[PDB]
């Protein structure tokens, strides 16, 4: 499941696998895709906040494989404009960008 808040221009975007507690959740595959789908960053969650400085483009962040007992979440479009305009499934935001992946 995918949200947005707040926690060429770059735009610095926070990003953090969640569950439904909120909790940060560790162990899984992480990739960001730029708009050609092409793979630019890949890590593994750790219990902390991933940070990320983008330019202005379509991505999208791909779970690529789920810890135990979770089932890989959906994809998450998202865009950057050169304000730093940040937008996922229609909510946009300025400022502190903050990005995350619930996992059930």
Not at 16 to 22: E, H, M, V, Y
Not at 68 to 87: C, L, P, S, W
């Amino acid at each position: 499941g995918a949200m947005v808040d707040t926690l060429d221009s770059a735009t610095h975007i926070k990003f953090s696998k969640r569950d439904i507690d909120g909790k940060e959740l560790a162990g899984a595959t992480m990739e960001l895709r730029d708009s050609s789908g092409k793979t630019i960053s890949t890590w593994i969650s750790d219990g902390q906040v991933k940070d990320f400085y983008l330019m202005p483009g379509k991505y999208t962040f791909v779970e690529t494989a789920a810890p135990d007992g979770y089932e890989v979440a959906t994809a998450i479009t998202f865009t950057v404009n050169e304000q730093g305009q940040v937008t996922v499934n229609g909510k946009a935001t300025k400022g502190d960008a903050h990005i995350v992946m619930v996992d059930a």
